[PDB]
Symmetry: D2
Subunit: 453 residues, 4 copies
Amino acid sequence: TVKVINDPIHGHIELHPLLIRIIDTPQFQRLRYIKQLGGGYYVFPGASHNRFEHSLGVGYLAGCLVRELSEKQPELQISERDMLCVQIAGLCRNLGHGPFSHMFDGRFIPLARPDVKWTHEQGSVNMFEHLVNSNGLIDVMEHYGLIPEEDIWFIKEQITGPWPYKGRPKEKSFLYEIVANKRNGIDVDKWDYFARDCHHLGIQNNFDYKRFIKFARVCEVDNKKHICTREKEVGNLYDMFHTRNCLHRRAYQHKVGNIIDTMITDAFLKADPYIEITGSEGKKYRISTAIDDMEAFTKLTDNIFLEILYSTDPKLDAARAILKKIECRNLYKFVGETQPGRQDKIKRENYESLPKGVASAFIVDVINMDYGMEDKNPIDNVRFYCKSDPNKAIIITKNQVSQLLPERFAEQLIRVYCKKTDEKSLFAARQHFVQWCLDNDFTKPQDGDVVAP
Amino acid sequence: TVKVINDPIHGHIELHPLLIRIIDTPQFQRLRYIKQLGGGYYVFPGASHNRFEHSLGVGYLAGCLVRELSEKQPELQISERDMLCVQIAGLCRNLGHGPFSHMFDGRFIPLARPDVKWTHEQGSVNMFEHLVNSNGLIDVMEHYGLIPEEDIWFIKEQITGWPYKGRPKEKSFLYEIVANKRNGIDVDKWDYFARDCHHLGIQNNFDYKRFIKFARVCEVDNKKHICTREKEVGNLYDMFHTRNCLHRRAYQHKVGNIIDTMITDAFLKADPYIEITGSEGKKYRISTAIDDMEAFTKLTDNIFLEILYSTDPKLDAARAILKKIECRNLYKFVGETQPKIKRENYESLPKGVASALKAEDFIVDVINMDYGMEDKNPIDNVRFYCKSDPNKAIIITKNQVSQLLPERFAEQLIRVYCKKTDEKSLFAARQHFVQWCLDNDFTKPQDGDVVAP
Amino acid sequence: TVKVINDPIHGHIELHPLLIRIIDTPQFQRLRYIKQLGGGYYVFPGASHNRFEHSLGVGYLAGCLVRELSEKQPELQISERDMLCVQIAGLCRNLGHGPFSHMFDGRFIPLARPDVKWTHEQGSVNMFEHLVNSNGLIDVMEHYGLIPEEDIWFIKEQITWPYKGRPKEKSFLYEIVANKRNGIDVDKWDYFARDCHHLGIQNNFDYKRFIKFARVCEVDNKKHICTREKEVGNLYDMFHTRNCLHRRAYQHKVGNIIDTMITDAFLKADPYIEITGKKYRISTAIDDMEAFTKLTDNIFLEILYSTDPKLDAARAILKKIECRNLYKFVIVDVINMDYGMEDKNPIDNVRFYCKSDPNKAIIITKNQVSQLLPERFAEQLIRVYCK
Amino acid sequence: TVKVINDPIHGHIELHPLLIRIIDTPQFQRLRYIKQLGGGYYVFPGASHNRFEHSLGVGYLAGCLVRELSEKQPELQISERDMLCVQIAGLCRNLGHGPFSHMFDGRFIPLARPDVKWTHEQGSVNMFEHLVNSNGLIDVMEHYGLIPEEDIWFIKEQITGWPYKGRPKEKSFLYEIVANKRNGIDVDKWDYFARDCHHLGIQNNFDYKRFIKFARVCEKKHICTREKEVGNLYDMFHTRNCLHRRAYQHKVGNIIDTMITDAFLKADPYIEITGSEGKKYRISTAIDDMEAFTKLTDNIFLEILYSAARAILKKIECRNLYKFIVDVINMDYGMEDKNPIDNVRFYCKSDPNKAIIITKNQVSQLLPERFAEQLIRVYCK
Ligand SMILES: Nc1nc2c(ncn2[C@H]2C[C@H](O)[C@@H](COP(=O)(O)OP(=O)(O)OP(=O)(O)O)O2)c(=O)[nH]1
Ligand SMILES: Nc1nc2c(ncn2[C@H]2C[C@H](O)[C@@H](COP(=O)(O)OP(=O)(O)OP(=O)(O)O)O2)c(=O)[nH]1
Ligand SMILES: Nc1nc2c(ncn2[C@H]2C[C@H](O)[C@@H](COP(=O)(O)OP(=O)(O)OP(=O)(O)O)O2)c(=O)[nH]1
Ligand SMILES: Nc1nc2c(ncn2[C@H]2C[C@H](O)[C@@H](COP(=O)(O)OP(=O)(O)OP(=O)(O)O)O2)c(=O)[nH]1
Ligand SMILES: Nc1nc2c(ncn2[C@H]2C[C@H](O)[C@@H](COP(=O)(O)OP(=O)(O)OP(=O)(O)O)O2)c(=O)[nH]1
Ligand SMILES: Nc1nc2c(ncn2[C@H]2C[C@H](O)[C@@H](COP(=O)(O)OP(=O)(O)OP(=O)(O)O)O2)c(=O)[nH]1
Ligand SMILES: Nc1nc2c(ncn2[C@H]2C[C@H](O)[C@@H](COP(=O)(O)OP(=O)(O)OP(=O)(O)O)O2)c(=O)[nH]1
Ligand SMILES: Nc1nc2c(ncn2[C@H]2C[C@H](O)[C@@H](COP(=O)(O)OP(=O)(O)OP(=O)(O)O)O2)c(=O)[nH]1
Ligand SMILES: Nc1nc2c(ncn2[C@H]2C[C@H](O)[C@@H](COP(=O)(O)OP(=O)(O)OP(=O)(O)O)O2)c(=O)[nH]1
Ligand SMILES: Nc1nc2c(ncn2[C@H]2C[C@H](O)[C@@H](COP(=O)(O)OP(=O)(O)OP(=O)(O)O)O2)c(=O)[nH]1
Ligand SMILES: Nc1nc2c(ncn2[C@H]2C[C@H](O)[C@@H](COP(=O)(O)OP(=O)(O)OP(=O)(O)O)O2)c(=O)[nH]1
Ligand SMILES: Nc1nc2c(ncn2[C@H]2C[C@H](O)[C@@H](COP(=O)(O)OP(=O)(O)OP(=O)(O)O)O2)c(=O)[nH]1
Ligand SMILES: [Mg+2]
Ligand SMILES: [Mg+2]
C-alpha cells in the first residue's frame, strides 16, 4: 500500500510500497541523526533539519521530473520500473554522509586520512549495498517488478557514475541527469535543499523548480539524448547558480559557522584514537576508520558529538575541552577575510604552511566558491529548444543572455582566525593579517583601514 | 553588546548581553538536543526543531509584549529591570524538559517513579538555579542593573507560580506574560503555534501580532490584568481552537503517541543499566537523574542512540524495542473511542479489554483534550475593554459571543493498540475493542460497522 | 497548444488550448473588473484581487480533483473529455457575478426589483451561453472532442434522475464544481487560500490533503465522492474556516456598511445610468447578457466622475465613502452565518471509508467525532447603522 | 486617534491620526484605481494590486526606519515632527502616477506631448499641494505639531529634491529614506520587492528587516550599514534587476502597455475630463490641472471599451495581440552606467562612527563587470 508523508516543503508526497521498504531500515533511518548543515545550526537556530527529510524530498522531486518526461514524451518509452529506480536513487543519494554532513568528508576525513579517496557519493552506494543485503530487499525488488542486478547497477550509477554505463542503454542516457547531473549540476538534489535550507534558516530562495519542470524536455544533441529546457528560461538557470552561490556566502560558508566546524573536527581528531565503534563481526573502529565497514558507519552519526561531551574518560578530556569551548561560546576570534588571484590561488598541498606565513608578516581556512563545474560555466553545458522546433536544441552563450552576468565563475576566499581571545592578541593578530595581505599582494580587507592604518 | 539571531519564525531578534550569557551555558545549550515534539518527528519529518529554538522565541515574544505595555501605558512604570526579568523567564521557561519533551514528564517519570511529583516547571527553576550558580552570573545580573535576591524569585515565579513576593501586586500583570496561570494566554503558546506549524506543515489560525496590538492593562477587582479589546474575543476562542487542532492533528497522533510509548517502554527496561554522572561524581539512572542538575544537564535525546548502539548484553530488551521502531514494527492501532477515567484507573483498562490475547497484549492511551483549564472556559477569566472607556474591564460571556462555540470544554479520547500484529490477532483485537465499548457504554468507533459487523 | 499561467496561489497551472479560447472572450475577461470581496478592499487593503483570477483557480482545482480520480480509479470510465467539461464549469462558475459581487446579487437587486429572483448561478449559465455563442466556439468544442448538446447541458447543470448532462453512473462529477449535497466543492478551496493570502488572514484547511484521500464509493446504489475516516475532523475545520472568513472579513461591520452605501448610490443612480441595441439600466442589465458584459465595478467610478445633476444624490454618497464619512455603527443588517445548508449539518451528508474495505461508505455522526463541536450550525446576527 | 490596518505584506500597521486624514481624501483614494504593475496584470493574474496599498507600505517602512534611528542614536536629535514628515513623504511619493502607472509617464505622455517634461514626482508634489488645499489640512497639520511652511517644503523635497530649504544639512540623512538620490536604497524599493513578489508569484531575495537592524548615521551625514551587509546590497539591486526581467519588462506584458498607449493616443481627440471650473481636459492634458488628474485613473480604459480606439482594446481582450513596433528597454542598477554601491559607506564593529568605502573587488569577483545594458524587442502588428 502507498503511504503519504506531510512535508513543510512539498506537502503530501506519495511513496511506493517498495520505497517504504527502503526507508524503514536502520541504514536509512540513520539519517535522522545527521544534520544537513552541520555546524550551521549553532549560528542559524532554525537549521535543525537532518539528512532524512532531505532524502525524502530528493526522492519525491526525482519522481516528479521523471514522470513529467514520460507523460509529455511517451516516445521515450519510460517504464514504471525506470521511474521507481529513479526514485530509489533520489532517496539513497544521501546515504553516505557522515557526522554533521560536509564536515566529515570535507574536513575530518581529509585531515585524518590524507591519502584515502572518499566522498559521500561513494558512501551512498557502499551504504546502499549494505542496506539491500542486510534487509533482504533483493526478493522485495523482484516482487515489485525490478530486475536486481541491472537495476542495482542503474541506481548506483545515478549516485556516483561509472558509453561507460552498465545499468541502462545509452538510448536512455537522460535518466542520469535527474538525481546527480555530472554534466551541468541541474539535478533534483539542488532544488530540494534550496527550498528546505531557506525554509529552515530563514533566508530567501531565487529559483522556482516547478516552473523548470513544466518546461523540461529530452532532446538529441551530439548523437546523445540530454535533458533540455526552453530558451526563455535561460535567465533563471543563471539565477539558480546565483541562488546556490548566495546560499553559500550567507550560511554554508559563514565564518562563525565554519570556525565551529573546524573546532568539531579538531575535537574529533583528538577523540579519534580512543572512540571505539563496534562494526561488523564484532570488530572495533575509530571515527576515521568506520567508513571502511558499513555496519560500523551505520552507527556513526552526530551522537559522536554528545558521546565526547557527556564523557568521563580521561583520554577524551582534550576533545571534551574543545566542545566545552563551543557550548560556552568561547570561539576562535575571526580576524579578517581576503582573496587571492585566479593565478595566485593557493593549492591544497600548501594549506599546512599558511599560519606560519601570517605569523611572519592562528587558523586559516580556504574556501573555493565556484558554480559547480570548477572554473567553467555550467550553462554552456545546457541545450535549449524553441517553441517552433522542440527537437532542435541550440546553444545559448553567456554573452547572448546579459551583459551583467559574472565575468568569472570561480573564486577563492581566505578566512583567518586567532585562538587567543586577548584584546591585545586580537589587535596584534589583526595587524599581522593586514600586512600579510599587502605582502602577498592579496585584496584589501573590508575592515582594513579601521583595525590597522 | 547585543547580538542578533535570525529565526525562520520571527526574523532578526535582538538579545540583551545578559540574555546572551544566559544561553551560552551548557544547561541552556543542552536544549539543542531535546526534540520539541518528541516522537512526532517519526510521523511529521519536518518536526526536527528542538527546545532551544523554541526558548528564544518565547523570550523574544515575552519582550515584545512587555515592551508594548511599557510604551503604551507609562502609568504602569515598567522598568528596564522588569522587562529584562520577563525575557529571562521566557528563555528559561523550558529548561526543565527531559528527553523527547512531554514524553519524559508525562510518561516515563510517572511509571519509573510514581511516588514523586515532578513537572518541567519544577525542573526549569531547579535548572535555572544551577545555571546561574555554575556559571557565576549573579554578579553579571548585578552588572546589568538587577537585584538578584528579588529578581531571581521573580524569574522563578513567572515559570512555576497575594502569593508572589518577587514583584508587588501593583505589577501583577507581569505574571500573565510568560506563563499565564489565570487563563493560559501567554507568549509560550504563540511561539509553538507558529513554530510547530512551520515545521509540521500544518496551518495556524491565530495571529499574535494582532493580539499584542490591542493588549492593555486595566484595573478590575482592584487588581491589574492584561486585557484586549471587545473585538478580539472571537480570535481568542480560535486560539484555543487552534491549540486543539495542533493537538488533534500532530501532538496526539495515534502513531506518534505509540512511538512515544515504545521509547518509554525501552527507557524503563534500560533505566537500571545506564548511569548518568554528575554532582560530586555520583552515578544516576534515567529516572533518578532528575534529582541532580549536573546529571540532568547531560540527560537529553542522546539516551535514545546510546541504547541503540549499546554493546551491553544487559540492554537487549531495551535495544529490541528501539529497533522495532527503526524497522517500524510498531504496535497496531485498533480503534479510538470516548466515554471521565481517573488517572489512577489507567493501569486497569488493559485487563478490561481482554475480558470483553492476554492483558499485556493491549495498550490503552487516554488523552485529555481540553482548553487549558480542565472543564472551565478560559475566556470567562478574560476581561475586555471597549473603545469608549478603555479603562473599564467588562466581561463577555459565551452566549454574547456566539452560539456556535463548543458546548463543553473538556473531553477524553481512548486509543487501543495491540502488541500482536498478525492478521488473526488484529482481528480479535478489533472484536474485543468494539465489545469493550458496549460493556462500558462508550462512543461508537468510526470504523466499527465495517471492521466488526 | 498549451499555455501555463503563474498564479500566486497554485503556482504554474497548465490550461488546455480550448480553455484558453474561452478565457480570451469579452465575457470572461470582464471579470478582471469585479472585485472578489467587493467592499472588503476598503477595509482590508490587500484584497484587490478580482473575479478573473479566482476563476482560473476553481477550474485548475477542478482538473486536479477529476484527474486524481481517474488515475486512482480507471473503473469509472472518466474520459479525457469528462475532465475537460468539469474544468469548463469551474472556470464559468463565476461569470454571473455583478458589480462588487455579493453587493449586487445580495442586496442591490433584492431591493431594486423584488419581483425577480436572481442568482449568480443563473447569471453564469446565461453569460456562459452568451459566451459560447458570441464567440462562435461551439465550433471549437467539437474540435477538441466534445458533443455540445449534451456537454453544454452537463456544464450548466454543474453550475445550477434529474440531470440530463450525464447518467447516474457519472453522478460524482456533479460534486466537484458546485456541490449541492454537502458543499465540499473546489470553489471553496480556492477562495479559502486566495482570500487569506490577499486579506492577510490564516487559512486552516489543507485541500491538497483532502484530494489525496478522495475516492468515489457506491452508497445507496449511487456513486458519491468520499474521504477517509481520519479526515472528518478536517472537514469540520473546513466550515470552521469558512465561518472565520465571514466573521473576520466577509461580514466585517464596516465592510458591510460600505457595501450598503454603494447599493444606495446605485439605487438613486438606477434610472439615470444608461447601459447600451437598446439601452439598459444597472437594474435591468441582468436581462440582457450583452449589457451585463459592460456592467462591472466601473459603474462605481462612472457615477463618481459624472457631472449630470440627476446623479447628484448618488454621487454625494460615493463622496461620503472616499472621505470615510460612513454610517456610524449603532439601515439594519441581518446576517445568517450557517454551514452552507441552513440549519443542517453538512457532515451528515458526507460518507467515509476505511482501509479494511475502501468500498464501504459509512456515515459518521457528530457525537462520534468530538464532543467539543458546535451545538447548532446556523445562527442569526442583527446590526443597526445610523444613516 | 490611531488606526490599525491589516496588510498581507507588513501585517498590522499603525497610522497617526494625521496620516488617516491624508488617506481619507479623494486625491489619495484615487490610487485605489491605478494598478501598480499596469499591463503585467494581463500576463501575471495575481498582480492586481494598486498604488494605494503600495503607498501605505512605503510610509510604514519610512516610519520604521526613521523610528529605528531615533531609538539607537539620540545624538541625532530626531523629533516626532521629523518622523511625521517622513511618513507623509512615504505615503505621498506615489500620488502623481497616472493610469496604469508607468505606461502613462513612460510611453504615453512622451508620445502624446513630446514637448512636455512630466514625471510622477512632479505630479506627486503637485497633487500633494492639491490634497492639503482641497481638504483644508493646513490647520490640522499645525494642530498635530507641524510647522506647515517649513515642513511641507521638506515633504515635497523628500520626493523631488546644502540646497535644501526644509531641513538643515545637520539632518541630511532623512532625505535618504523616502527617495534616495545618492544610491537608491530607499524604503519605496523595499515595499514593491515584497508586494510585487507576493502577488506576481515571484521570489524575493532581499531582507529589508535585516538591513534596518544594521543602519547607522555617520559623518555631511549619510545612512550606512555594517561591512557584512555589502553582499546583501548587490543582491538587492540584483533582486530587482531580476524583477524587471520576469515581470516589469515581460515581452507580452510590455506589448500590452504599448497597445494601450496607441488606444489612448487614438482616444485623445475625444477624451473629455472636467477640471478646475468645468473646463474640459483630455487624457494628455489632465496633468496640467490636478482637479482633472484626480479623476484620471484606469477608468478611462473601460470608458473607451464600453463606448477606432475601441478596436485595439477589443484586440487585447480577445488576445489578438501583436506577435513577438520596436521597444527599447534600459536595464540599469538605477544610476545609469554608474555603480550604486560606490556611493554607500560602511562601518565596522570596531569604530561604529568611522565610515569606510568598500569596492567591488573587495566583495567578490562573481559580480557584474558593467552595470547597464539595453535590450531591443521587435513585434509584428
Ligand atoms: N497537513 C496534514 N498532515 C497530517 C494530518 N494528519 C496526519 N498528518 C500527516 C502525518 C503523516 O506524515 C502523514 C500521514 O499521516 P496519516 O495520519 O494521514 O496516516 P496514518 O498512517 O497515521 O493512518 P493510516 O495508516 O492511514 O490508517 O500526514 C493533517 O491533519 N494535516
Ligand atoms: N552567542 C551565540 N550566538 C548564536 C547562537 N545561536 C545562533 N547564534 C548566532 C548569533 C551571532 O551573531 C552569530 C555569531 O556568533 P558569535 O557572535 O557568538 O561569534 P563571533 O565570531 O561573531 O564573535 P563575537 O561574540 O560577536 O565578538 O551566532 C547562540 O546560541 N549563542
Ligand atoms: N554548513 C555547510 N554545508 C555545506 C557545505 N558544502 C555543502 N553543504 C551543504 C549545503 C546543502 O544543504 C547540501 C548540499 O550538499 P550535498 O552533499 O547534499 O550534495 P552536493 O555535494 O552534490 O551539492 P552541489 O551539487 O555541489 O550543490 O550540504 C559547507 O561547506 N558547509
Ligand atoms: N536573513 C539573514 N541572516 C544572516 C545573514 N548572515 C548571517 N545571518 C544570520 C545568522 C545569525 O543567526 C545571525 C547573525 O549573523 P551575523 O553574521 O550577522 O553576526 P556575526 O556575529 O557572525 O558577525 P559580527 O560579529 O556582528 O561581525 O543572522 C544574512 O545574510 N541574511
Ligand atoms: N512508514 C513510515 N511512515 C512515516 C515515516 N516518517 C513519517 N511518517 C508518516 C507516514 C505514515 O502514514 C504515518 C504513520 O506511520 P505508519 O503508517 O507506519 O503507522 P501505522 O500504524 O498506521 O502502520 P500502517 O499504516 O498500518 O502500515 O507517519 C517513516 O519513516 N516510515
Ligand atoms: N508530541 C507531543 N507534544 C506535546 C504534547 N503535549 C504538549 N506538547 C508539545 C506541544 C507544544 O509544542 C509544546 C507545548 O507544551 P509545553 O509543556 O512546552 O507548554 P505548556 O505546559 O504551557 O502547555 P500549554 O501551553 O498549556 O498547551 O509541547 C504531547 O502529548 N505529545
Ligand atoms: N515564476 C515565474 N513566472 C514567469 C516568469 N516569466 C514569466 N512568467 C509567468 C507569467 C505567465 O503567467 C506565465 C507564463 O509566462 P511565459 O513568459 O513563460 O509565457 P509566454 O506566453 O509569454 O512565452 P511563450 O509564448 O511560450 O514564448 O509565467 C518567471 O521567470 N518566473
Ligand atoms: N479610515 C480608513 N480605514 C481603512 C482604510 N483602508 C483599510 N482600512 C481599515 C482600518 C479601519 O480600522 C478599518 C475600519 O474603518 P474605519 O475605522 O475608518 O470606520 P469605523 O466604523 O471603525 O469608524 P471609526 O473612525 O473607527 O470610529 O478600515 C482607509 O483607507 N481609511
Ligand atoms: N464582502 C462579502 N463577500 C461575500 C459575502 N458572501 C459571500 N461572499 C464572497 C466571499 C467569497 O470570496 C466568495 C464565496 O462565495 P461565492 O460568491 O464565490 O459563491 P458561493 O455562494 O457558492 O460560496 P459558498 O458555497 O456559500 O461558500 O463571495 C458577503 O456577505 N460579503
Ligand atoms: N489579521 C486580522 N485583521 C482583521 C481582523 N478583523 C478585522 N481585521 C483587519 C481589518 C482592518 O484592516 C484592520 C483593522 O480593522 P478592525 O476591524 O480591527 O477595527 P475597526 O476600525 O473596524 O473597528 P473599531 O473602529 O476599532 O471599533 O484589521 C482579524 O481578525 N485578523
Ligand atoms: N508593468 C511595468 N511596471 C514598471 C515598469 N517600470 C517600472 N515599473 C513598476 C515596477 C514597480 O512596481 C514600480 C517601481 O517603480 P516606482 O514607480 O515605484 O518608483 P521608481 O521609478 O523610483 O522605482 P526604482 O527606485 O527605480 O526602483 O514600477 C514597466 O516597464 N512595466
Ligand atoms: N493568452 C493569455 N495569457 C495569459 C492570460 N493571463 C495570464 N496570461 C499569461 C500566459 C501567457 O503565456 C502569457 C503570455 O500571453 P500569450 O501567450 O497569450 O501571448 P504571446 O505573445 O506569448 O502569444 P502565443 O499565444 O504564446 O504565441 O500571459 C490570459 O488571460 N490569456
Ligand atoms: Mg458552493
Ligand atoms: Mg526610487
